[PDB]
Structure 1
């Protein structure tokens, strides 16, 4: 930490504060994450795992600094998060080819994490990072299980209904909501509490039953008393997404995590037949 000059705070989350910083020796510009708390021996090994987990679409973890009984993670710096890019692109929308590129690339990262049994668990526009060359990368995970107002908007229903051992399918759910948001320019499920989140999901997708989701009615926080809403058609939920986009989105948004599409199969969905890598117009 002596080795870095902080340039500016660029974020804050569950696990710490993030600064853009410069290596005082070598002039490298990095993102420096100070982990909020001795460090436990099992976060140390979980972090060692992450350092090896490298992929073009995963933010690179450069160095792990466990000194004076604090933890710092030194990451490559990316110049913009997708939340800011979405906000900046609100008048016209992000062009479809660019949405499709990003969704393709994020599935590719997720496919890689998931083959390694690593889950993100908290995907959101603020955790997705872009560059001037047209890449997008997932950031700020492995953190979730390594260590043990929060946004709920991208939370899978199994998590809101009290499932303790959830699967990679929670990340596909999240990425689904995000896809929809890029296309409509509105948040799909903008909840402000756990039950508001769950009921906004229930009014759009319909209240889940044993028919759409076997097991649902015995989950910890399921209540027979939940209201009964009817599902809406995706034609109403995500115009102007074409039928291929909607076909894919419905598969990412299946109630039953085991029916929900995997990242690897999503990469083969007909939606990505004509995928290309456009260059975004970034104002930095």
Structure 2
């Protein structure tokens, strides 16, 4: 670590504090995250998982029982950009570009059997060129209140062997939030999160989600709410966008659209790559 000069604190991350730093050997500006052998090996595998829509893991430094992760640096996260665009809204072509790029990143990771598990606006980073990238990819398998807003229902219901579908759910929640300028399911406890999902999408049952009633944290005493139309949930999203969103928010993880199939969706027939106003 004597090769890095800290510039400023850029986040109180999930596993530790993230700093903007300068590498003295290469002159490179980086993001430095200060965090067992199982972890060293899994983290070392993430150094090979390179894609244009994944924030690059440059190096892993294990010294004096501390672990430092050196990442590519980007200047803004999607949370800040959404807050800055609250009065006007992010233009639909840019929302579409960002969703398309994030699905490309997820298709890549998922093809290598790597899950993110904690997608949220704070770990989606943007640049001046119109790119958006997934940050902290794979750190949840390897290792302030953690937000539950983007957590898939199977996780909330106690599935310990969940799938790549959890990342599609989180991304669907983020898509809805870009469109409406408000979080879709802002729960402040696990039960509040689950019941907010149920109030919008309907309480799940064996018809829509075979096996749901046997899940660990499923309770037959859950209230039975009717499902709402998506036209009420994400106005003024068009029918292609609503169709895609509905497929990203299917209850059954097996029915939920994959990232690769989502890329082929008609919503992306007119996708472009606009420059954001930063």
2-side partners of 1:239 and 1:264: how far apart? 26
Give the CA deviation at 1:110: 0.2
Distance 1:203 1:46 in 2: 38
Aligned counterpart, 1:93: 89
The answer to whether the 8 A contact 2:54-2:137 is kept is no
Higher mean displacement: 10-19 or 242-251: 10-19
Question: CA offset at residue 69 of structure 1?
Answer: 2.1
What are the within-5 Å matches in structure 2 for residues 44-123 of structure 1?
44-123=40-119
Give how far 1:71 is off. 0.8
Cα distance between partner residues in 1 of 2:190 and 2:144 = 20
Q: Deviations over 1:101-149 (max 9, x none)?
A: 0000000000000000000000000000000000000001210001191
Cα displacement (A) at 1:25: 3.1
1:237-256 map, 5 Å:
237-256=233-252
CA distance in 1: counterparts of 2:225 and 2:215, whole angstroms: 19
Q: Alignment partner of 2:186: what SS?
A: coil
Distance of 2:220 and 2:116 partners within structure 1: 31
TM-score, scaled to structure 2: 0.99
CA distance in 1, matches of 2:129, 2:69: 25
TM-score, normalised on structure 1? 0.97
- 2: CA distance, partners of 1:158 / 1:105: 25
SS in 2 for 1:44: helix
- Of the structure 1 ranges 46-55 and 23-32, higher mean CA displacement relative to structure 2 is found in 23-32
**62-71 or 51-60, which moves further after superposition?**
62-71
Uncovered stretches (5+) of structure 1, i.e. residues with no partner: none
Counterparts of 1:19 and 1:47 in 2: how far apart (Å)?
A: 19
Inter-partner Cα distance in structure 2 for 1:96 and 1:21: 34
Distance in 1 separating the partners of 2:263 and 2:235: 22
1:279 and 1:236 map into 2 onto residues whose CA distance is 30
- Structure 1 ranges of 4+ moved more than 6 A: none
How many pairs were matched up?
A: 278
Q: What is the RMSD of the two structures over their aligned residues, measured on CA atoms?
A: 1.3
- Superimposed CA distance per residue, residues 155-189 of structure 1 (whole angstroms, 9 cap, x where no aligned partner): 00000000000000000000000000000000000
Q: Which moved more, 1:12-21 or 1:106-115?
A: 12-21
The answer (yes or no) to whether the contact 2:115–2:167 under 8 Å persists in 1 is yes
- Is the 2:53–2:104 Cα contact (8 Å) retained in structure 1? yes
